[PDB]
Amino acid sequence: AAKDVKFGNDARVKMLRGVNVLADAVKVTLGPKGRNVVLDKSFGAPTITKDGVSVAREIELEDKFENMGAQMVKEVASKANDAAGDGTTTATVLAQAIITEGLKAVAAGMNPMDLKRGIDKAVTAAVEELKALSVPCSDSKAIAQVGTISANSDETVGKLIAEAMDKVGKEGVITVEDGTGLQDELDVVEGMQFDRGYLSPYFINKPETGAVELESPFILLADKKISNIREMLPVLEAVAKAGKPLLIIAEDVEGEALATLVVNTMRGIVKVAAVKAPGFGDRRKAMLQDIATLTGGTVISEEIGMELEKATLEDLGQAKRVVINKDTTTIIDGVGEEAAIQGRVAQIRQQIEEATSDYDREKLQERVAKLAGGVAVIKVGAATEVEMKEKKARVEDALHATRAAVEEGVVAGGGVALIRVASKLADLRGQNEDQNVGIKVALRAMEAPLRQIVLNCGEEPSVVANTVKGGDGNYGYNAATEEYGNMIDMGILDPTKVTRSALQYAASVAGLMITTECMVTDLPK
Amino acid sequence: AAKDVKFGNDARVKMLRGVNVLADAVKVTLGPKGRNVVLDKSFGAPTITKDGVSVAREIELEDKFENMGAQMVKEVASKANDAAGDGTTTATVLAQAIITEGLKAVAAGMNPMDLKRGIDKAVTAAVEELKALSVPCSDSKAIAQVGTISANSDETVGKLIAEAMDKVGKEGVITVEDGTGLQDELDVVEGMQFDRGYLSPYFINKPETGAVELESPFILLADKKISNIREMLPVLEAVAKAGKPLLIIAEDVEGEALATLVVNTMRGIVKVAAVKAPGFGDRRKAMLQDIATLTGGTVISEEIGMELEKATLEDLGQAKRVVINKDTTTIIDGVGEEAAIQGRVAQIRQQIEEATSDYDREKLQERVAKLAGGVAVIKVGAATEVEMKEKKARVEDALHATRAAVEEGVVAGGGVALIRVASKLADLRGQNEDQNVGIKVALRAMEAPLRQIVLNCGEEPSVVANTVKGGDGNYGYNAATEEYGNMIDMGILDPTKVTRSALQYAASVAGLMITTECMVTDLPK
Amino acid sequence: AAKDVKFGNDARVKMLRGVNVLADAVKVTLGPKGRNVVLDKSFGAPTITKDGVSVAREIELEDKFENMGAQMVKEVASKANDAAGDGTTTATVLAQAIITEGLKAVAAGMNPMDLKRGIDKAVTAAVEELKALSVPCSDSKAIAQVGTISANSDETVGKLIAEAMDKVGKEGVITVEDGTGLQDELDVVEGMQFDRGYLSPYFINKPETGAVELESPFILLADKKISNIREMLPVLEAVAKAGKPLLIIAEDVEGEALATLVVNTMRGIVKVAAVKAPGFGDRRKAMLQDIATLTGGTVISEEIGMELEKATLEDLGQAKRVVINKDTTTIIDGVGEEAAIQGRVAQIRQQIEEATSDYDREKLQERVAKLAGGVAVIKVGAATEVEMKEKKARVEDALHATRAAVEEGVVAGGGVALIRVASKLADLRGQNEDQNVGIKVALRAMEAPLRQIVLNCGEEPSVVANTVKGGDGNYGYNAATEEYGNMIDMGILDPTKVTRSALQYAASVAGLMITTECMVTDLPK
Ligand SMILES: Nc1ncnc2c1ncn2[C@@H]1O[C@H](COP(=O)(O)OP(=O)(O)O)[C@@H](O)[C@H]1O
Ligand SMILES: Nc1ncnc2c1ncn2[C@@H]1O[C@H](COP(=O)(O)OP(=O)(O)O)[C@@H](O)[C@H]1O
Ligand SMILES: Nc1ncnc2c1ncn2[C@@H]1O[C@H](COP(=O)(O)OP(=O)(O)O)[C@@H](O)[C@H]1O
Secondary structure, three states: OOOOEEEOHHHHHHHHHHHHHHHHHHHOOOOOOOOOEEEOOOOOOOEEEOOHHHHHHHOOOOOHHHHHHHHHHHHHHHHHHHHOOOOHHHHHHHHHHHHHHHHHHHHOOOOHHHHHHHHHHHHHHHHHHHHHHOEOOOOHHHHHHHHHHHOOOOHHHHHHHHHHHHHOOOOOEEEEEEOOOOOOEEEEEOEEEEOOOEOOHHHOOEOOOOEEEEEOOEEEEEOOEEOOOOOOHHHHHHHHHHOOOEEEEEOEEOHHHHHHHHHHHHHOOOOEEEEEOOOOHHHHHHHHHHHHHHHOOOEEOOOOOOOHHHOOOOOOEEEEEEEEOOOOEEEEEEOOOHHHHHHHHHHHHHHHHHOOOHHHHHHHHHHHHHHHHOEEEEEEOOOOHHHHHHHHHHHHHHHHHHHHHHHOOEEEOOOHHHHHHHHHHOOOOOOOHHHHHHHHHHHHHOOHHHHHHHHHHOOOHHHHHHHHHHOOOOEEEEOOOOEEEEOOOOOOEEEHHHHHHHHHHHHHHHHHHHOOOEEEOOOOO | OOEEEEEOHHHHHHHHHHHHHHHHHHHOOOOOOOOEEEEOOOOOOOEEEOOHHHHHHOOOOOOHHHHHHHHHHHHHHHHHHHHOOOOHHHHHHHHHHHHHHHHHHHHOOOOHHHHHHHHHHHHHHHHHHHHHOOEOOOOHHHHHHHHHHHOOOOHHHHHHHHHHHHHOOOOOOEEEEEOOOOOOEEEEEOEEEEOOOEOOHHHOOEOOOOEEEEEOOEEEEEEEEEOOHHHOHHHHHHHHHHOOOEEEEEEEEOHHHHHHHHHHHHHOOOOEEEEEOOOOOHHHHHHHHHHHHHHOOOOEOOOOOOOOOOOOOOOOEEEEEEEEOOOOEEEEEEOOOHHHHHHHHHHHHHHHHHOOOHHHHHHHHHHHHHHHHOEEEEEEOOOOHHHHHHHHHHHHHHHHHHHHHHHOOEEEOOOHHHHHHHHHOOOOOOOOHHHHHHHHHHHHHOOHHHHHHHHHHOOOHHHHHHHHHHOOOOEEEEOOOOEEEEHHHHOOEEEHHHHHHHHHHHHHHHHHHHOOOEEEEEOOO | OOEEEEOOHHHHHHHHHHHHHHHHHHHOOOOOOOOOEEOOOOOOOOOEEOOHHHHHHOOOOOOHHHHHHHHHHHHHHHHHHHHOOOOHHHHHHHHHHHHHHHHHHHHOOOOHHHHHHHHHHHHHHHHHHHHHHOEOOOOHHHHHHHHHHHOOOOHHHHHHHHHHHHHOOOOOEEEEEEOOOOOOEEEEEOEEEEOOOEOOHHHOOEOOOOEEEEEOOEEEEEOOEEOOOOOOHHHHHHHHHHOOOEEEEEOEEOHHHHHHHHHHHHHOOOOEEEEEOOOOOHHHHHHHHHHHHHHOOOOEOOOOOOOOOOOOOOOOEEEEEEEEOOOOEEEEEEOOOHHHHHHHHHHHHHHHHHOOOHHHHHHHHHHHHHHHOOEEEEEEOOOOHHHHHHHHHHHHHHHHHHHHHHHOOEEEOOOHHHHHHHHHOOOOOOOOHHHHHHHHHHHHHOOHHHHHHHHHHOOOHHHHHHHHHHOOOOEEEEOOOOEEEEHHHHOOEEEHHHHHHHHHHHHHHHHHHHOEEEEEEEOOO
């Protein structure tokens, strides 16, 4: 259709207004003292929340161009979220600060590319600096502490997460489920995990979860593109008569077969979840054989000769519970016999022994690791279902934070790491004047997080920011108690990885955002 | 004509808008670092200035309600200027802060009477506190220093003012003059000062000066009311032949006579200035006799028998110079015989000796004081008339500041003394909640001048205010150097009297403002 | 009346619009390749012109904001022109460039007063740099060359100015006059100069000349304030009988006497021009006595006793000619006896010998200089009256340029000297970021004049500016020949004084306008 186009400073100010609207919408909820925000519901009561992610997913603007700026900040915030799992408000605030300053500089007539280059230099310097300032979290006690603070200061959740972390090692797989008894339970059962996502979002049985949980499902293994709907018809009849959930792992799924499965899920007669084949080529087939071993299933490939039509209920594997996340998938207690799994472990281990390629050897090593380590299973213990699910969600976010911190590290919360980095790197210069201006933009930009936190606390942001700048080390201003002190001593912490990713994504989005001219759109009808 | 009436919250917010407009327009120029402001001029180039008084005298609003609010806040600011001579901007800023907060509270529904009483108590406490915090300035050294800083850090002006203060004693009279030579000149000649102004503003021959300077005039003493201008008809004809300025000291002058003389001055054939007779009854007559002795004049009174028509040129007194300020008038080098003046001094001396009533002794004592001390005159010395004018203005404002300081005292400049007072009086509680709220309003409101100066310096208001509050004694913040330190060391000081009067007038105007409900005004045509 | 107020970015952008409008209007005509502009004329065909002052003096906006913007820019430019005489377009262009950049930076949140301080540092550095770069013009040949350049490549005018300069010495004064003969005439007669102008513009007999030229006028010497019209009635009748122009030199002129002189000149019964007395006090009286000696007049003073009423035709002086300039005035061939003038010169010489005050000695020295050296008159030689007038104007402004060059010096023309200055001062760093930014603004600012000149030549400005920047010394770009080369060789050079003053005034006005926010205006009607 006829598409409008505007470019130059006018488009820049429009997109600036849009991102400003979104930033004002989301920044309020930052911090403990982040104020409540009320969001719509087409029926019934409006919802009340302090979670910025809901605000981001629910916000869009009537004006096209402002809406598009809002979408830029929204998608980069979501990228940060899926990268780490928290701190989305922090990333959005950083983005607003950097982008507002960059636009006002561009209004001053500076060269945009020089500003972008200076920003890139400043942000990479900050990344390496905070990497230096990172503190390892390998010790169990700090893991318990971070899990505690993430779960609204619940020490039991931290203890359980730490124990599970011990059980399955540093890079194990942990899943949480509902426990019947009032006491928490923990058990290591061999399972599987791999990074693949659902074919369509429509498979999500619990939209709030964002994932598909299936109990006692039947798993289909395939190394072929599922061109036609006639291929899986016997399997569909089989799972219809079985009356149980169905999981599919295929090299590819076409739009038509997926759409038919979507129609089937809306029919509710059969609930089908489909995922892509992990790995590539030979390695893909090798872990497909691993899955067949784990579930007692059979691998169906075009090259060997068998097809999906020649599929029986026996041919498919099985397991006790599978979860299909946004881009991950895990399986728990595959029916496949442990002895066959051990034989496969030995085969892959001797393959490692004869391995000469480094990357293939690493693939085999991680394959045996995921195959032998298994999966830890938490079972939430409480009285009523409401607190069952509350504890479940708290455990989920806590373990996400814990694995994030374990992966990279941890620093003092309150954004104090950012301002400390700013004080350290204030002297960093650029090749030319405009690059230096962008450097200064970045250096004064990451004061915004604690500033907005203080604003949500009601105190004057500038005074507290100056006070923190005066202090050194891990000294800052507890928002909850509204008093100064060392965050580490009082348990306030934040993973290094989440802050690093947030800053990187904010810098990247701002760099591409400032350098845009032609904000095209469709005719407003 | 027709008129309307407005009242309620809408009325108060109208007042608030008007006073806010004027307060911003003037406060932008506060401080030595005060921002410039551009003023109209129907003919030729517009003016650019930093003086708040110029801004104040040229503000009126299209809307009647905003206009009247601005008019009355401007009026009280002018009252403050008349009290001391400086600190108009500070007074207006104080007024803005207090009225804004108080009307906010009035919107919050608290009893306005309670707030007025609370702020009255708070301001009285602050006044006595700053009186306790006053520092004497009787020594010539501090006199020279304050005169120096007042005259744009000109030590020669301060030295001259100190010398004149020594010459004419603690409560002497000092008058500025243009000196022919390049060297700065000082002299002492018997003059005569009294607290009466011109009857009509039209008399002001030098409106920028705001006074009437007449050289070698004829002075007419009249202890009667000027019922008709025919009483003046003969004598005026005489001064038409003399071609010299004319001064009249009259017990009263009826409005029609004033109009006739104003017409005669618009024609300017006769340069007539009239002033009401100070004193009261017997005191007025005795001091008029003193005037007759001083100038060689003669008192014309109805009861004794002589009349104004029967007045000759020789009957009028004379003096080498006279100046008529807005509410004061001084005379320099009265022609009248010094021996006769000394005889009159002796006569009033025996009157003091025989005087038993306290106020009779006081009035006779001040009479002999003003009769014997004379007037010290400082004549500017330089090569160019431009420097003559600027140095005249500098010496003028400097000696007003010096006498203000001598009258009561001197304290730290920049309003830091107000901050110290507020810190001292943070404990004062009202009889009930609302009175205490008003007290809080007052004690947090006198922080405004420092904040405004910080804005005029571009620094963070809250940060600097907190820094000053942390400090004790006179530890303030030199704005010119932009450095913290003891205020007296760099010597930026202010008279106690001017700050006290400004705060008192701001308190009064805010108190009456809060209890305002109804404006009656002409329809906007 | 009720006034509107505006403050903040709205005020700044209004000012920006006004300055941009006038800057285009004035900068269009820069260069010998400058364009043409036609102005209003209520009757007859309007005037096409090229002069910067001609276009500038009629510029004003219907919108009051932009109007007063243009007003103060125009007035600063005009007083800069009064200082030197030329470079009006250059001053306006410099002001526009600096203020546009400064307001852009202010819109970028830069601290205004810091920018002003950086501008101050930059301009003082530029002044010292250019004065170091100045080239003396004491040699007569360069004086003739610059006179030729100013006078549209007329070597005769520059030559004649050179011989006149020789006749009256380096610091002499030369006045142009109409010459009867085809050959130009030169003479030296005992003239007089003093720095006082007409009391009102209405005395200007030739508005284009901007002065009051009176042939054979009677001179009235007065050392008193002329209070009333009654005093000069007898002299008015005497000069009406004489049927000749009248000049008054008076200590002070009142408003009413001035207005009556104005209406009497509009009646034209008497063509009287009044001027304030030069100097101050004793020296004023002494050189007034010198005037009486020179012209055969007599000094009338109140102190001595005689009155202006007691004035006869003999008492008044006389001279062959007088010209009251804007702020100075000249007299030609006073009637007073030469022997008396020489005796007075000797008397003042012995006063110099006994003079111990340095400044008084300098005053006496310049007194004897202006009394003895006199004035050289150049009488234009040509055939027809049109060339009489045009060559008279050419001689006048060429002499102005020549004296301007003599006072300070001369540097490379076409603004290339500014480019060299900027290159020399590229390294100057401010105390902080904002001062440095202002310094950069200033350094790029004085490139605009050269760019504008190139634009008025039609060539691309940036390439020529870069070419000049690469070149060193005085290698500039002759606009007329449209080619590069050493600026001195073709001799297009500019006085150091005019450029210095123009840049200083532009910096002053720009700094003032940057640091102002509030702005009043009358109601729009
Ligand atoms: N007691 C506290 N001390 C320091 N920072 C806090 C405290 N409580 C909340 N915060 C701030 O909240 C920020 C993020 O809060 P979070 O609950 O993750 O919101 P979001 O999920 O939107 O990022 C952290 O960066 C942290 O600085
Ligand atoms: N550098 C400075 N340091 C401290 N005080 C200052 C400075 N500049 C101005 N002030 C304070 O501001 C007050 C008012 O400033 P002033 O220029 O007098 O405005 P106004 O003439 O309207 O009173 C003064 O009492 C003075 O003490
Ligand atoms: N051929 C040229 N070469 C170099 N400079 C020129 C030339 N023509 C004009 N200019 C420059 O233009 C400036 C202003 O020219 P002028 O005619 O004086 O305009 P204005 O009267 O407005 O100052 C001068 O300083 C001069 O150096």
